[PDB]
Nucleic acid binder design. Structure first.
Ligand code: MG
Ligand code: MG
Ligand code: MG
Ligand code: MG
Ligand code: MG
Ligand code: MG
Ligand code: MG
Ligand code: MG
Lengths: 146, 49, 103
RNA sequence: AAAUUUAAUAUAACUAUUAAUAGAAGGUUACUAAUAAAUUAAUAAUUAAUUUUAAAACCUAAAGGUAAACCUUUAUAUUAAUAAUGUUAUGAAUAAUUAUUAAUAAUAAUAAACUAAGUGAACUGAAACAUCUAAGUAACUUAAGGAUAAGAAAUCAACAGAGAUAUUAUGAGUAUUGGUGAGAGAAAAUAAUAAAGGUCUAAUAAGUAUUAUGUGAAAAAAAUGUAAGAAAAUAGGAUAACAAAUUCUAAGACUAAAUACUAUUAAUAAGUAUAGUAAGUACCGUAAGGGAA
RNA sequence: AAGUAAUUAAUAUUAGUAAAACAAUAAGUUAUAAAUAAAUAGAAUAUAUAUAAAAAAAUAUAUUAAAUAUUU
RNA sequence: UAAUCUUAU
């Protein structure tokens, strides 16, 4: 496969600070997602889609009469257990993604898998979840005092 | 705040560090000389041919 | 001799810089973290038995070999034999003709 | 020895090409919205370069509003500490004003073309029309950068070989293909243009390759929705299919240069005075919008 | 205020060179051999020969080449 | 019925 609608997204490169005319009031809680939020099938940003998007193609008849149609991924809203968070997390879930999760053994595992492909096929929400989980894990491992 | 490293990532980093610790096979001057000599010989052979 | 070496093509020189002939690189596949590990061969990592893709993509390796051949310096490279790529005269010699040609 | 002419040059035109270099405020009306140096070189004034420095009202989606150039908050702010001061109740306590010191937030005016991505007509052509065509074009929408994209082969080739991309000559209107109509149309190879062009940043990659099915650059796939779903270099991919043989290593990455568009400078004009600076004004329309002399 | 431009193709005329031409980095284009769907086939007055269908080889049909010399 | 889904607090 290819992650063409993820790895093609580009975000305004930040100027690092050794002030700007408009600085935000709050503090960036989460680390910046490499690929940013998708401006294409924004339904996907709410949950875990595995880099699957709406396709647009042609309905074709017996007379070869083309007529535009769309294809949706099989999204299902699904509350799934996270050992690290110690609670079930409900999200939108392409059934493929669900299957993958099942295979890999847990949502935490899915989130915290290293490969770039996995990173790509998380959403911004997915990224956030991953951050939460890994941070939690770190905390568990390493209390402030050894 | 930067995302914390994953276990696998950490391991990889460690491995990299270990690799770095060892001496890099730097090019030997003697070796270079030898190579040059070989090249010269080859050239001579070609000329002869 | 040094001058001659310098004269050689750039790619070859570069290769020499990181993989000199002082060390004898193993003919067969190895650990990826051994220092006698051949760049041209797909070596394996000890932790996680995963064959790493060759440190020189095949094409590049082939090019390097060709360059070496051109300036006589074949033996100072590591051995290619275990990659199935042969070159020029030897290849011609050792080629078993195809089933379709023979019968 | 002064004038006259000819040709060239401005702060003072635009347009096309070529070469170089670089990637930037509008309005409104007024309590009008200003400057100050230093250092270095040239010759105390000097010009230039390199610098630091003052001011700068209001408006131009997002301090919060509104009927743009207004209103509303109240940094001639609040809190704390003190100091002089007046009043009250009991030297100590409470409130008020002024003055110093400290603490605590302040202001999305920002291009256009070029690039990438999402969706994606129709007129039209076919001498009708529905497959096809126009066309992944216009248009709308989103996002980045000085450029972007691409890029070091799971590529091409043919048993001889080459060796990243980009796009120009040829190849070639050839192969390929099409209601085999309208029509569409490669690649290898050889040349130019180009830059040092190679180089690790992956503990080397599955819900991935692949298959089935629905779509999918008129010719060459790579993509993709839905479900099935591998293998360790003793292994994978590449061709209707199989057998040989070749070749490359997917599911991890970075990448200057040639290129596009803008702006400036320089040059060249069998270019423009109805393509020669006014004005996006007058005027027309509720408006988008049109638009003179 | 109305037959223009670009990229091609075919004819003509004139010029350059000419069994070669253009380009000359290497390619490539056209010509130099006709014919056949294609294939391993292909030129001495014609009555000889080449290719196609046919065939043992000719004939027969079509087109081509071929006449002390100096190639088209 | 700790599939999925609907409403109220
Ligand atoms: Mg009001
Ligand atoms: Mg588009
Ligand atoms: Mg880039
Ligand atoms: Mg890239
Ligand atoms: Mg087309
Ligand atoms: Mg691999
Ligand atoms: Mg690779
Ligand atoms: Mg009016």
């Amino acid at each position: 496969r290819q992650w063409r609608l993820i790895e093609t997204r580009k975000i305004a490169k930040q100027p690092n600070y050794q002030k700007p005319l408009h600085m935000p009031k709050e503090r960036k809680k989460f680390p910046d997602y490499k690929y940013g939020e998708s401006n294409i099938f924004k339904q996907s940003n709410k949950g875990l889609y595995g880099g699957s998007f709406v396709q647009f193609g042609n309905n074709i008849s017996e007379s070869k009469a083309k007529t535009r149609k769309k294809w949706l991924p099989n999204v299902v809203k699904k509350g799934l257990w996270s050992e690290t968070l110690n609670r079930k997390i409900s999200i939108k879930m392409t059934a493929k993604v669900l299957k993958t999760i099942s295979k890999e053994g847990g949502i935490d595992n899915y989130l915290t898998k290293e490969k770039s492909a996995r990173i790509k096929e998380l959403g911004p929400t997915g990224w956030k979840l991953r951050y939460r989980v890994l941070k939690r894990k770190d905390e568990i491992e390493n209390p402030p005092h050894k | 705040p930067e995302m914390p490293l994953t276990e696998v990532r950490k391991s990889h980093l460690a491995e990299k560090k270990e690799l770095a610790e060892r001496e890099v096979p730097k090019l030997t001057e003697e070796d270079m000389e030898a190579i040059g000599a070989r090249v010269f010989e080859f050239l001579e052979k070609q000329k002869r041919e | 001799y040094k001058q001659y070496f310098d004269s050689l093509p750039l790619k070859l020189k570069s290769f020499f810089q990181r993989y000199p002939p002082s060390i004898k690189y193993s003919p067969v596949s190895t650990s990826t973290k051994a220092i006698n590990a051949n760049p041209f061969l797909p070596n394996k990592h000890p932790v996680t038995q995963r064959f790493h893709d060759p440190k020189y993509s095949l094409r590049r390796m082939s090019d390097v070999y060709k360059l070496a051949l051109r300036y006589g310096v074949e033996e100072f490279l590591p051995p290619i034999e275990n990659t199935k790529k042969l070159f020029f005269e030897e290849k011609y010699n050792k080629k078993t003709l195809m089933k379709g040609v023979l019968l």
